[PDB]
Amino acid sequence: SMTDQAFVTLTTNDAYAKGALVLGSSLKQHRTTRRLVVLATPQVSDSMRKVLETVFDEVIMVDVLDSGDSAHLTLMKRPELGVMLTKLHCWSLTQYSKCVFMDADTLVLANIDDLFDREELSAAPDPGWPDCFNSGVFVYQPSVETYNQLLHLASEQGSFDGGDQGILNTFFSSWATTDIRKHLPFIYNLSSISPAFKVFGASAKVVHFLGRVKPWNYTYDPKTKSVKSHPEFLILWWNIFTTNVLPLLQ
């Protein structure tokens, strides 16, 4: 419908694929009018890609190890940054005029199509260092130029933790001090999970399972309808997975 605009996510393996399936199913559930796109690598199994195609309108293959890939020369300088370099291809999707990137470890609790009212680069503050934006949810404008500049910066600067957040904050360095409309409310990337969430946590639009253990790393027990050691968000992830993802398998 709005074929010109997309939610874009990323998976480089079958584990994070499970996250993308929950994310995508949650966006469908809350009736997005936009396209759903997943960047996938050849490390994602063919069988899992078949499941991704039931949720996503486009499963777009990216392989930074292929010498024909635009990021390949950069990977040879920074071989440790394969995942980040795959992610940056989100900017190469110039068939779309505007997109919202979302991490595969996010989950949507309401329609968030009003994010397309925003301009590049709009993003929520990161907890822990809130003059940096968290790069798990952001509104951007695909551009070969912007893409090539991000590649250059990745080449020059690298990434201590292998993430793209430092690079995106270096490139978009006016975010902290310029144009409050480019600060997404924290409820669009609620990543503190693990008094304020009493008052405002009920109005979350997006939950982000930022940090070491992802929901799919838990062992789910049908017998108790919970995981094994606000646990609510974790339960909701698994609720979407069991109710909405599993039956796509028919």
Ligand X SMILES: O=c1ccn([C@@H]2O[C@H](COP(=O)(O)OP(=O)(O)O[C@H]3O[C@H](CO)[C@@H](O)[C@H](O)[C@H]3O)[C@@H](O)[C@H]2O)c(=O)[nH]1
59 versus 126: smaller Cβ distance to Mn ion: 126
Q: How far is CA 149 from CA 10, 89, 97, 220, in A?
A: 20, 12, 18, 43
Which of Mn ion, ligand X, a copy of itself, none has residue 199 at its interface (CB below 5 to 8 Å by kind)? a copy of itself
Confirm or deny that 16 is annotated as ligand binding.
Answer: yes
Closest distance of CB 157 from a copy of itself, Å: 10
If binding is defined by CB under 6 A, does position 186 make contact with ligand X?
no
Q: Assign 3-class secondary structure to the chain.
A: CEEEEEEEEEECCHHHHHHHHHHHHHHHHCCCCEEEEEEECCCCCHHHHHHHHHHCCEEEECCCCCCCCCCHHHHHHCHHHHHHHHHHHHHHCCCCCEEEEECCCEEECCCCHHHHHCCCCEEEECCCCCCCEEEEEEEECCCHHHHHHHHHHHHHHCCCCCCCHHHHHHHCCCCCCCCHHHECCHHHCECCCCCHHHHCHHHCCEEECCCCCCHHHCCEECCCCEECCCCHHHHHHHHHHHHHHHHHHC
User: Which residues in the 169-228 window bind a copy of itself by CB under 8 A?
Assistant: 176-180, 183, 185-187, 192, 195-200
User: Count residues contacting a copy of itself (CB under 8 A)?
Assistant: 28
Closer of 11 and 26 to ligand X (Cβ): 11
By CB under 6 A, residue 105 contacts ligand X: yes
Q: Given the complex with a copy of itself, which of 133 and 147 has the nearer CB atom?
A: 133
164 binds, options ligand X, a copy of itself, Mn ion, none, Cβ within 5 to 8 A by partner type: ligand X
- Asked if 2 is part of the footprint of a copy of itself (rule: CB under 8 A), the reply reads no
* Residue 82 in contact with a copy of itself, rule: CB under 8 A: no
Q: How far is the CB of 193 from Mn ion (least distance, A)?
A: 11
Distance CA 198, CA 37 (A): 34
Place of tokens 């409309």: 181
Q: Does the annotation flag 27 for ligand binding?
A: no
What's the CA gap between 207 and 98, in Å, rounded? 22
- Give the interface segment with a copy of itself, choosing from 24-32, 44-52, 124-132, 226-234 (CB under 8 A): 124-132
Binding piece for ligand X, criterion CB under 6 A, among 55-63, 142-150, 156-164, 177-185:
156-164
**193, 233 in Cβ contact below 8 A?**
yes
Closer to a copy of itself by CB, 74 or 169: give it.
Answer: 169
What residues line the site for ligand X (CB under 6 A)? Answer: 9-13, 16, 83, 87, 103-105, 134-136, 161, 163-165, 210-211
Under the rule (CB under 8 A), what is the footprint of a copy of itself?
Answer: 124-132, 160-161, 166, 176-180, 183, 185-187, 192, 195-200
Binding residues for Mn(2+): 103, 105, 208
The residues that touch Mg ion, with contacts defined as CB under 5 A, are 156
